[PDB]
Amino acid sequence: RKFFVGGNWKMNGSKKENDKLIEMLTHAKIDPNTEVLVAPPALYLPSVREKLDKRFHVAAQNCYKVPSGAFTGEVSPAMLKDVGCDWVILGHSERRHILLETDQLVGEKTAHAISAGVNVIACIGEKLEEREAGKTEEVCFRQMEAIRKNLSMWNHIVIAYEPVWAIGTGKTATEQQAQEVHLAVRRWMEEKVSPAVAKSIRIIYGGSVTAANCRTLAKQPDVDGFLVGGASLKPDFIEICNANA
Amino acid sequence: RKFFVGGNWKMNGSKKENDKLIEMLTHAKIDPNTEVLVAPPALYLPSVREKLDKRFHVAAQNCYKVPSGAFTGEVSPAMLKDVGCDWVILGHSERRHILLETDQLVGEKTAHAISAGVNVIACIGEKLEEREAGKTEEVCFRQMEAIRKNLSMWNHIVIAYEPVWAKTATEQQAQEVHLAVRRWMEEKVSPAVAKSIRIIYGGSVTAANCRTLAKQPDVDGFLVGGASLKPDFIEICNANA
Numbered sequence: 001r002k003f004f005v006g007g008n009w010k011m012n013g014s015k016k017e018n019d020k021l022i023e024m025l026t027h028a029k030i031d032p033n034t035e036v037l038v039a040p041p042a043l044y045l046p047s048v049r050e051k052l053d054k055r056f057h058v059a060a061q062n063c064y065k066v067p068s069g070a071f072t073g074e075v076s077p078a079m080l081k082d083v084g085c086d087w088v089i090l091g092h093s094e095r096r097h098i099l100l101e102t103d104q105l106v107g108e109k110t111a112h113a114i115s116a117g118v119n120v121i122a123c124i125g126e127k128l129e130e131r132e133a134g135k136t137e138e139v140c141f142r143q144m145e146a147i148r149k150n151l152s153m154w155n156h157i158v159i160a161y162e163p164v165w166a167i168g169t170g171k172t173a174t175e176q177q178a179q180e181v182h183l184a185v186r187r188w189m190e191e192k193v194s195p196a197v198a199k200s201i202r203i204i205y206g207g208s209v210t211a212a213n214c215r216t217l218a219k220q221p222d223v224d225g226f227l228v229g230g231a232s233l234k235p236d237f238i239e240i241c242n243a244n245a
Numbered sequence: 246r247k248f249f250v251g252g253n254w255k256m257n258g259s260k261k262e263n264d265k266l267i268e269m270l271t272h273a274k275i276d277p278n279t280e281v282l283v284a285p286p287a288l289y290l291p292s293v294r295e296k297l298d299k300r301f302h303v304a305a306q307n308c309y310k311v312p313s314g315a316f317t318g319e320v321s322p323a324m325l326k327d328v329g330c331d332w333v334i335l336g337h338s339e340r341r342h343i344l345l346e347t348d349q350l351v352g353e354k355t356a357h358a359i360s361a362g363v364n365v366i367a368c369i370g371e372k373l374e375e376r377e378a379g380k381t382e383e384v385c386f387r388q389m390e391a392i393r394k395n396l397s398m399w400n401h402i403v404i405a406y407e408p409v410w411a412k413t414a415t416e417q418q419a420q421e422v423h424l425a426v427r428r429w430m431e432e433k434v435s436p437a438v439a440k441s442i443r444i445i446y447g448g449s450v451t452a453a454n455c456r457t458l459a460k461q462p463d464v465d466g467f468l469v470g471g472a473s474l475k476p477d478f479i480e481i482c483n484a485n486a
Contacts, residue, residue, distance in 0.1 A: 011309060011316040014327045041320050042287040043328050062318030064256060070470065071256040072337040073307030073344070075286050082259045083288050092317040099318070100345045229315065 003218070003244040004158055004202045004225035006037035006121055007232030008061065008089060013041045021233065022051050028238045031245040035225070037121075038232070039089055042075060046083040059087030059121065062095060065108040067116070077116035088113050089227070091123040091143065093162045093206075103146035111150035114157070121227060122147055123206060124185070125162035128169050137184055144188060154197045159185060160227040162206040173207050175216050175223075182222035211236040214243035248459070248485040249403055249443045249466035251282035251366055252473025253306065253334060258286045266474065267296050273479040276486040280466075282366075283473065284334055287320060291328040304332035304366070307340060310353040312361070322361035333358050334468070336368040336388070338409045352391035359401055366468060367392050368447060369426075370407035377410075382425055389429060399438045405468040407447040414448045416457045416464075423463035452477040455484035 018040060030036060037057035040048045049058040064074035080088060090113065091106035106122070113120050126139040140161070151157070161181050166173040182203045190198035205217055206227035217223055228240055254266075263285060275281055282302035285293045294303040309319040325333060335358065336351035351367070358365050369392075371384040385406070396402070406422050408414045423444045430439035446458055447468035458464055469481055 008317060010314070011311075011319045011321060012313050013324060041324060042318075043290055043320055043324050045288055047291065066256075068257050069255065070339060071343065072253060072334065072339040073287075073305075074256045075288055076256055079256075079258065079286060079288050089317065094315060094317040098316065 001200065001202055001224045002035050003031070003033060004035045004037070004204055005228065005237075005241045005243075006039060006057075006059065006089070006158075006160075006204065006226070007228045007237050008039045008092070009041065009232055010061070010094070010229065011041060012233055013044050015044075015047075017233075018044055018048055019051070022048065024235065024238070025052065025056060028241075030238065030241045033245065034241050036241055037087055039087075045080070045085050049084045057087050057119075058085050059089055060085060061089050061092070063088045063090070063109060063113055063118070065105070065112045077113040077118040080118055081116060086117070087119045087121065089121045089123065089160075091147075093123060093125055093164045093167065096123075097127070097164065097168075103143050104149075106143070107146035107148075107150050110147050110157070114151065114153065119156040119158070121158045121160050121204070123160045123162055123227070125164045125206070128165035128171075131165040136181065140181065140185060141188055144185070145192070148192060154189075154193060154201060158202045158204060160204045160206040161185060162227075166207055175213075175220055178205050178207065178217060179220040179222055182220065186222050209240055211239040214240040218243035246441060246443055246465045247280055248276070248278065249280045249282070249445055250482045250484070251284065251302075251304065251334070251403075251405075251445065251466070251468045252478050253284045253337070253468055253470055254286065254473055255306070255339070255470065256286060257474055258289050260289075260292075262474075263289055263293055264296075267293065269476060269479070270297060270301060273482070275479065275482045279482055279485060281482055282332055284332075290325070290330050294329045302332045302364075303330050304334055305330060306334050306337070308333045308335070308354060308358060308363070310350065310357045322358045322363040325363055326361065331362065332364045332366070334366045334368065334405075336392070338368065338370055338407045341368075342372070342409065348388055348391035351388070352394055355392050355402075356395040359396060359398065362401075364401040364403070366403045366405050366445070368405045368407055368468070370409045370447070373410040373412065375410070376408075381422060385422065385426060386429055389426065389433075393433060399434065399442055403443045403445055403466075405445045405447040407468070411448050416454075416461055419446050419448065419458060420461040420463055423461065427463050450481055452480040455481040459484040
């Protein structure tokens with residue numbers, strides 16, 4: 001499996017700061033075996049895609065579930081392709097838990113994006129009250145089942161596990177805890193989809209990753225990379241891209 | 246009150262179709278006394294603003310309530326200004342009822358955009374069951390209270406009434422709500438703000454009905470949906486002349 005590092009800029013960006021990030025990425029020494037993605041705010045997707053070499057993927061942070069229609073404020077996968085972007089992040093914990101997106105909606109968006117020819121980073125993960133009730137697998141598997149319900153092919157999917165129970169609380173997840181979830185998710189893929197897909201699919205870690213912990217997380221056998229948050233805006237991003245080499 | 250016509254493109258747009266719409270706007274003769282706005286999808290805001298003469302406003306169809314933060318998929322008023330756009334539509338019925346935005350969130354976004362120097366079309370309106378229950382005013386006034394609560398200045402606000410309940414809305418029904426909202430502004434904000442604020446109609450607006458709607462004394466323009474993608478938009482922009 002090819003190591004995969006995606007930088008989610010979240011709601012951060014400006015012509016000035018984007019240019020500084022692009023110059024940092026363009027000039028950095030990055031492991032040639034790392035697949036690298038950045039996800040700017042939607043206003044900046046076309047310009048960031050023009051300025052950054054195709055060695056870098058550029059992703060939207062969200063999209064909707066049909067090509068066009070009466071959905072004020074939404075953008076479709078067809079529009080993403082029209083501006084040269086071939087990736088989207090769907091189901092991020094902030095969209096599920098702050099902006100109230102349901103499992104079913106995330107699954108419908110994922111299936112439509114794939115149908116349009118857009119690759120998807122599909123995000124899953126459980127909150128603290130769910131983890132403390134023993135529901136880590138139940139929650140992760142329910143979110144994946146909603147994606148599988150509408151998907152017939154997985155070659156253009158990357159799964160991101162977000163330990164929301166740690167992100168939202170200030171707790172720190174150990175590399176052993178991340179590995180344990182990644183393994184359970186991979187076994188679900190083996191069981192519900194196929195051993196070949198489970199063997200191929202990248203499962204990336206979306207808890208807090210900085211230059212300080214990326215190398216120990218990267219060595220875990222079922223962690224295939226990272227969905228990076230705030231470190232995506234900083235020189236730490238380069239060390240994270242290099243975490244596996 | 247200066248007549249105001251906004252075209253909400255919703256989730257419609259592409260480089261090719263945007264170019265046809267931009268050429269349509271550019272070749273049009275529009276009443277010089279009418280304020281005209283278009284709202285493309287967020288991906289296309291910088292290019293549309295670059296390509297359209299500054300006689301036209303270019304608006305986002307949504308934004309968030311702080312300048313930056315951990316809100317994957319959201320954009321801020323600061324970003325809008327950074328790409329040259331100084332307008333946003335907030336509280337549209339599709340965002341309230343499909344995408345689950347609360348009254349409080351719409352009010353927070355509206356106050357923040359205004360504080361950031363972005364002008365706001367703030368949308369209100371009642372659903373069919375609410376209208377049939379006699380709750381048009383109750384709903385509209387509850388929505389305006391959340392918008393009004395933390396606003397101190399109204400010169401950069403336009404109110405859009407969307408009869409989500411429509412069925413067909415008559416010019417008498419639109420006038421009745423616009424008048425009620427204006428009288429609410431008189432008592433809750435001030436008579437001076439009420440006399441000057443634009444209240445635009447955002448129900449189904451076509452070339453066939455825009456002139457009858459425009460003559461109503463408390464209808465100050467339109468927030469147009471599907472007709473904003475068609476040459477019919479120009480006739481609607483010219484409805485007051």
